[PDB]
Amino acid sequence: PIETVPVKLKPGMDGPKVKQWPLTEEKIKALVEICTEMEKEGKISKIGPENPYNTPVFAIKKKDSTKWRKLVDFRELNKRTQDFWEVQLGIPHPAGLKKKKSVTVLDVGDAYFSVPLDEDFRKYTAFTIPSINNETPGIRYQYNVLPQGWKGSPAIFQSSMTKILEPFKKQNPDIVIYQYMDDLYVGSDLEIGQHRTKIEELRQHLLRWGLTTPGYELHPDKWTVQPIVLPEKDSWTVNDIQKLVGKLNWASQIYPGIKVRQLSKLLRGTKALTEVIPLTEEAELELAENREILKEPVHGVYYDPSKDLIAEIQKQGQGQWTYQIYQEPFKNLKTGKYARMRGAHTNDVKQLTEAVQKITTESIVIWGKTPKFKLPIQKETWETWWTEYWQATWIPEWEFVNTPPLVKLWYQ
Amino acid sequence: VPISPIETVPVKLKPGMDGPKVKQWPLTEEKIKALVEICTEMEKEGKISKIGPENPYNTPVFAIKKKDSTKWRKLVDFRELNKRTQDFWEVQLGIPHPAGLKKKKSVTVLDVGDAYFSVPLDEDFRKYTAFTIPSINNETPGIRYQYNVLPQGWKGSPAIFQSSMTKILEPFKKQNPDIVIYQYMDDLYVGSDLEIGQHRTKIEELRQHLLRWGLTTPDKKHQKEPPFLWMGYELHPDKWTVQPIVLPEKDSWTVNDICKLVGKLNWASQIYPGIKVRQLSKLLRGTKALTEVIPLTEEAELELAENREILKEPVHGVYYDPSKDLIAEIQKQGQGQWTYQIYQEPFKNLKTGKYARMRGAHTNDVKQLTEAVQKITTESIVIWGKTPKFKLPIQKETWETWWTEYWQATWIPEWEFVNTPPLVKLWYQLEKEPIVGAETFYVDGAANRETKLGKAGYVTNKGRQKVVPLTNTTNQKTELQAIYLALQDSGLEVNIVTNSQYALGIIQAQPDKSESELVNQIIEQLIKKEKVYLAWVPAHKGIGGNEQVDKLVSA
DNA sequence: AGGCGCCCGAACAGGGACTG
DNA sequence: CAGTCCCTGTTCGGGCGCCT
Ligand SMILES: Cc1ccnc2c1NC(=O)c1cccnc1N2C1CC1
């Protein structure tokens, strides 16, 4: 018997009606055995045909975990509860979280099952557990408590979270604590030994305040940005000079001071691609002057809170993938490269999934926000498999791209 | 007072709306004499009531007919009430495929009678029901009433039935974990691995649990009737098949004939292996009227023939055995057509299928194969809830060469080679590096937007030039057009420099087929070469011999 | 009247390069 | 700038198949 924070769908829009996608029998078993328990505990309960709403559900194992986690795709719901969270209650984003030598991510989502949910809102949490081959119809539930992964849930539990943590923050004023959905980001410049200890210390607090918590560490101070770089060549073919000028011509959308003039004149006649052409000094000085402008920052690139983040991924071959996060073309807030992720040399989709998760993470630690991805993949390919490689409790927004390689030039 | 059978389902109205008032619409004069009485029947059974003052509600009649009836089936039209009624979460998410069912020793079918009228309507919603229909011809204006149950043709009926039924059966199933029930509409299909007689024990014992809720299960139910006929299927506990397909032999061919034709073949493809619809579907291209006259081409007839011999002998599918692995094997049928069989024990198929869909303007076999594999995986998850082990006509090196090169993320799940020609191959590869001692063709093209007139040509390191005038063309086509020239005029190894991002993009994905005859031609030359290195430079940067061929064609 | 499949066309998005 | 085109991919709407 405690209060309930009323909640409303922002004006004009309805509850999510999105269709449930087919699950593996593996995942269908894990959901049944997970939901029956959540029913017994009165977290969710069965619903009828009078409720015409659905959100998709599936299950995942977190990285290095043999236990099945239930996962709801609340993206559609979260879009329709939005004014509630952003405008109404703010979370200051620690600009320091990124500078900490270490940051651990703890799953606090369980805490959310305490609080009751506005009885009027519950009809929008409706989700179907499907059957193999359509033999039974769906088992449909709705959420009585605060559903994991909904954007209101970390919001409404805000007061309670800020409370239970206040003891710890006071004894440890230098430790930085951020919260994004089901996750709690905790970081410090402490040596890892006492860090891992201070996290357990944090584990006990929520342990004694009625929460459970199933390394997790990120190391943001070590995060590198991948700069554009022109090759180092002893001797240059026409073809080399050509690939160089073209790359430089592209890069110049980013840096206006790049010049191809003298390097261009080198190509003058119609010459064999493999013919070897010596570098004039006037060009040699132009090339060396460019390599300089490419060690600089970019005028006027800064994060604007109101605008959405956008992330682009290119497949570079042999396990490498490059990415760029930006809010406006050619102004990149970050550029990077990944290699030898799980799946390297065998499964592209696994690797891209890994990439989207690492990118989303840095994106939350940095701006406290998940990016919108442009994925170098066919819609159906991604959709058929991504659910297999998914280790995260959130779900970024994505769209599908076909961009044959002239932008492949974020890496040699 | 009436009485109270089974748990009731809350029903609202689309907020800020209320029940309908309507004028009558035509219905046949003969059958309409029967119902004047029938309403009086239901009063006594609990299915009807009335009030004079309270209903500003009226509804018309429009119905749909069914074959194979020894008596006529009534209907009422709520179309006005419907649109004004809340939406439901639909219960039918689609239907099980016969091939996904596990073999059951014993399989029975109980048919629930008065199925829709056996379910209590929501107390508070009953009101919106009032209706009127012609007496015989007519005499007096009429009378009206309200519904105490689920009306035929109401938006909410199937959904509320399905959920109540599910709700009832639930406690039985838990007490009988190893029985297996399935509900389609008002019919239930039950099956078990118990002994033939002890099974019928549970069949009545279940007819018990249903009666306890007022659900009648007659004995027209048949243990001896199976095969059961359900939605085009014939089902025996051991094996299933499509119901017999009649392929028109008609000499008269209307675009509507080919259509009905194709649809039947496509329906045949779940079971009879190797059906090809490609050439017949071509006839259908760009026709104005569905009644139009069309002749059969030799290919389309050569195809129609091969399909007929497949249907000649009958065939049957097996059922699924969770203990044994799933296997999907694909064969290339050419012309971007694909067929697959999914089996467990060799030569006994669970099901078959085609993948014919040509996706994109320019494509190749690897891509189309990758796509079929995705079609099959998706289908496999729906049906068996797992992914099959794939047997594919493609060398493990062919595939490795493709996916690791392609710019997109692409994947096939666990699969092995089956050497069953035609094998899937890459018909050419572009060099990763300039070819020493090959002629270097700088190519360009330009056309004028207004005149649709243009020229395509090239310059080489050896001094060789060419320029060809072209009529009724576009900027893109000329850039393709110049690469084409450079292929034709070059030896077995060649480097080509193009500034067309458009052109570079097509060729680099190593297409083996195209909608476009010019790209097809580029392909044919590409397959003939030993070594082709194709490079890009930015336009108008005063580059190479690119500036020169630019002058030539800009001229 | 709707569900699931196919094949086709016509509409609609959006990405670059040319018009000026 | 725009504004235009040219091209290509997706997504929707219609006709059959199987059925309510
Ligand atoms: C039409 C249908 C649809 C779905 N399942 C079944 C059936 N009927 C069967 O013929 C059937 C056959 C074999 C095994 N299960 C069957 N059953 C399941 C109920 C035992």
Hey, where are the domains in chain A? 6-95+121-161, 96-120+162-217, 218-303, 304-412
Distances (CA, A) of B375 to A36, B332, B356, B434: 33, 15, 11, 39
DSSP letter assigned to residue A213: -
* Those residues with Cβ within 8 angstroms of residue B32's Cβ, 6 or more apart along the chain or in another chain: B133, B134, B135, B136
Torsion sign across C-alpha atoms A359, A360, A363, A365: negative
SS3 B104: coil
* Residue of B93, B106, B107 to test ligand 1 pocket, by largest number of atoms within 8 Å of CB: B107
Give me the count of residues in chain A.
412
Fold of domain A96-120+162-217: Alpha-Beta Plaits (3.30.70)
Looking up tokens 């091969």 gives B306
Domain range B428-555, its CATH number among 3.40.50.720, 3.40.50.300, 3.40.50.11290, 3.30.420.10? 3.30.420.10
Q: Which amino acid makes up residue A169?
A: K
Distances (CA, A) of B26 to B59, B64, B134, B143: 12, 13, 8, 17
Domains B92-116+158-226 and B321-427 belong to one CATH topology = yes
Residues forming a β-bridge with B108: B190
Q: How far apart (Å, rounded) are the C-alpha atoms in residues B545 and A241?
A: 13
Q: How far apart (Å, rounded) are the C-alpha atoms in residues B277 and A34?
A: 46
Nearest Cα to Cα of residue A356 among A366, A341, A345: A341
SS3 B169: helix
Torsion sign across C-alpha atoms B292, B293, B297, B301: positive
Distances (CA, A) of B315 to B343, B352, B383: 14, 11, 20
CB A283 within 8 A of CB A266: yes
Q: Cβ–Cβ of B440/A272 closer than 8 Å?
A: yes
Q: What is the CA radius of gyration of chain A?
A: 25
Domains A218-303 and A304-412 belong to one CATH topology = yes
Torsions phi, psi for B83 (to 5 deg):
-50, -25
In chain B, DSSP finds a helix count (H) and a strand count (E) of 13, 20
Q: How far apart (Å, rounded) are the C-alpha atoms in residues B355 and B364?
A: 14
Residues of B with CB below 8 A from A315's CB?
407-409
Class in CATH terms, A6-95+121-161: alpha beta
Q: How far apart (Å, rounded) are the C-alpha atoms in residues B62 and B58?
A: 14
Cβ–Cβ contact B497 with A under 8 A = yes
Q: How far apart (Å, rounded) are the C-alpha atoms in residues A188 and A169?
A: 12
CB B407 within 8 A of CB B506: no
Torsions phi, psi for A241 (to 5 deg):
-60, -30
Torsions phi, psi for B495 (to 5 deg):
-100, 135
* Burial class of residue B16, CB neighbours in 10 A (0-12, 13-18, 19+): exposed
Rounded (5°) CA angle B320-B325-B330: 90
Sheet holding B493-498, edge to edge: B465-471, B453-460, B439-447, B493-498, B531-536
CB A333 within 8 A of CB A326: yes
Residue B175 CA to ligand 1 centre (angstroms): 20
Nearest Cα to Cα of residue B139 among B231, B254, B36, B3: B36
SS3 B14: coil
**Architecture (CATH level 2) of domain A218-303:** 2-Layer Sandwich (3.30)
DSSP letter assigned to residue B405: H
Q: How far apart (Å, rounded) are the C-alpha atoms in residues B47 and B55?
A: 18
Q: Which two tokens stand for residue B248?
A: 């028109």
Cβ–Cβ contact B233 with A under 8 A = no
Q: Is A64 annotated as a binding residue?
A: no
Residue B335 CA to ligand 1 centre (angstroms): 38
Distances (CA, A) of A159 to A5, A6, A86, A122, A165: 12, 15, 16, 21, 10
Omega prior to B227 cis, within 30 of 0: yes
DSSP letter assigned to residue B117: G
Q: Which amino acid makes up residue B214?
A: G
> Between helices B517-528 and B501-508, what is the axis angle to 10°?
60
Q: Where are the beta strands (DSSP E) in B205-304?
A: 228-230, 233-235, 240-242
* Those residues with Cβ within 8 angstroms of residue A153's Cβ, 6 or more apart along the chain or in another chain: A112, A146, A147, A181, A182
CB B509 within 8 A of CB B471: no
Nearest Cα to Cα of residue B550 among B474, B438, B456: B456
Q: Which residue ranges have CB below 7 A from strand C?
A: A 403; B 64, 90, 92, 94-95, 262-263, 266, 277, 281-282, 284-286, 354, 356-358, 375, 446, 448-449, 475, 500-502, 539
Cβ–Cβ contact B12 with A under 8 A = yes
* Residue B498: its H or E element: strand B493-498
DSSP letter assigned to residue B126: G
SS3 A325: strand
Rounded (5°) CA angle A196-A200-A204: 170
Torsion region of B99: left, alpha or beta (phi above 0 gives left; psi -120 to 50 gives alpha): alpha
Q: How far apart (Å, rounded) are the C-alpha atoms in residues A166 and B63?
A: 69
Q: How far apart (Å, rounded) are the C-alpha atoms in residues A192 and A217?
A: 9
Q: How far apart (Å, rounded) are the C-alpha atoms in residues A69 and A393?
A: 9
Torsion region of B115: left, alpha or beta (phi above 0 gives left; psi -120 to 50 gives alpha): alpha
Protein residue closest via CA to atom 15 of ligand 1: B101
* Burial class of residue B315, CB neighbours in 10 A (0-12, 13-18, 19+): middle
* Those residues with Cβ within 8 angstroms of residue B376's Cβ, 6 or more apart along the chain or in another chain: B328, B330, B340, B342, B353, B355, B388, B390
* Those residues with Cβ within 8 angstroms of residue B171's Cβ, 6 or more apart along the chain or in another chain: B209
DSSP letter assigned to residue B122: P
**Architecture (CATH level 2) of domain B1-91+117-157:** Roll (3.10)
**Ligand 1: residues whose CB is within 6 Å?**
B 96, 101, 104, 107, 180-182, 189-191, 228, 230, 235, 237
Resolution, expressed in angstroms to one decimal: 2.9
* Residue A181: its H or E element: none
Q: Where are the alpha helices (DSSP H) in B94-221?
A: 157-175, 196-211
Q: Which amino acid makes up residue A171?
A: Q
SS3 B496: strand
Q: Which two tokens stand for residue B469?
A: 């005038």
Q: How far is A160 from chain B (nearest CA, A)?
A: 36
Residue B120 CA to ligand 1 centre (angstroms): 29
Q: Which two tokens stand for residue A126?
A: 């409706």
CB B183 within 8 A of CB B166: yes
Q: How far apart (Å, rounded) are the C-alpha atoms in residues B546 and B551?
A: 9
* Those residues with Cβ within 8 angstroms of residue B513's Cβ, 6 or more apart along the chain or in another chain: B336, B362, B363, B364, B520, B523
Nearest Cα to Cα of residue B19 among B209, B197, B154, B194: B154
Q: Which two tokens stand for residue B96?
A: 């099980």
DSSP letter assigned to residue B394: B
Distances (CA, A) of A232 to A226, A252, A287: 17, 19, 11
Domain boundaries, chain B: 1-91+117-157, 92-116+158-226, 227-320, 321-427, 428-555
**How distant is C1' of D6 from CA of B456, in Å?**
17
Q: Where are the alpha helices (DSSP H) in A13-157?
A: 25-40, 75-80, 82-88, 153-156
B 392-451 residues with CB < 8 A to A? 403-405, 407-411, 434-437, 440, 442
Torsion region of A240: left, alpha or beta (phi above 0 gives left; psi -120 to 50 gives alpha): alpha
Looking up tokens 């918590």 gives A213
**Architecture (CATH level 2) of domain B227-320:** 2-Layer Sandwich (3.30)
Residue to substitute from A128, A134, A248, interface B, most B β-carbons within 10 A: A134
Looking up tokens 């050497």 gives B419
Cβ–Cβ contact B113 with A under 8 A = no
Protein residue closest via CA to atom 7 of ligand 1: B189
Q: Which amino acid makes up residue B518?
A: L
Domain range B92-116+158-226, its CATH number among 3.50.7.10, 3.10.580.10, 3.30.70.270, 3.30.420.40? 3.30.70.270
Q: Cβ–Cβ of B497/A273 closer than 8 Å?
A: yes
Q: How far apart (Å, rounded) are the C-alpha atoms in residues A254 and A239?
A: 24
Fold of domain A304-412: Alpha-Beta Plaits (3.30.70)
Cβ–Cβ contact B162 with A under 8 A = yes
Distances (CA, A) of B194 to B106, B170, B172, B238, B465: 7, 20, 16, 15, 85
Q: How far apart (Å, rounded) are the C-alpha atoms in residues A301 and B367?
A: 40
Torsion sign across C-alpha atoms A100, A106, A107, A109: negative
Nearest Cα to Cα of residue A352 among B310, B406, B92, B246: B406
Kindly give the number of the ligand 1 atom that is closest to the alpha carbon of A135.
4
Q: Where are the alpha helices (DSSP H) in B102-195?
A: 157-175
Q: Cβ–Cβ of A246/B538 closer than 8 Å?
A: yes
Q: What is the CA radius of gyration of chain B?
A: 34
Q: Please check whether strand D approaches the CB of B267 to within 7 Å.
A: yes
Residues forming a β-bridge with B363: B513
CB B342 within 8 A of CB B328: yes
Of all nucleotides, the one whose C1′ comes closest to residue B260's CA is D16
SS3 B157: helix
Nearest Cα to Cα of residue A313 among A230, A364, A372, A393: A372
Q: Which two tokens stand for residue A325?
A: 């996060």
Would you say domain B321-427 falls under CATH 3.30.70.270?
Answer: yes
Sheet holding B233-235, edge to edge: B228-230, B233-235, B240-242
CB B245 within 8 A of CB B311: yes
SS3 B193: coil
* Residue of B102, B182, B186 to test ligand 1 pocket, by largest number of atoms within 8 Å of CB: B182
**How distant is C1' of D20 from CA of B301, in Å?**
34
DSSP A125-140: S-EEEP-GGGSS--EE
CB B103 within 8 A of CB B345: no
Q: How far apart (Å, rounded) are the C-alpha atoms in residues A89 and A91?
A: 7
> How many alpha carbons fall within 13 Å on the CB side of residue A156?
26
* Those residues with Cβ within 8 angstroms of residue B316's Cβ, 6 or more apart along the chain or in another chain: B239, B240, B241, B271
**How distant is C1' of D20 from CA of B185, in Å?**
9
CB B446 within 8 A of CB B455: yes
DSSP A266-318: TT-S---TT-B-PPPHHHHHHHHHHHHHTTS--TT----TTSPPEEEEEEEET
Q: How far apart (Å, rounded) are the C-alpha atoms in residues B446 and B466?
A: 14
Q: Which two tokens stand for residue A202?
A: 């944090």
> How many alpha carbons fall within 13 Å on the CB side of residue A53?
19
Residues of A with CB below 8 A from B460's CB?
270
Q: What do you get for the CA distance between the two ends of chain B, in Å?
A: 97
CB A55 within 8 A of CB A140: no
Size of interface A-B (CB pairs under 8 A): 187
**Residue B26 CB coordination number (10 Å):** 9
Q: Which two tokens stand for residue B279?
A: 């050439």
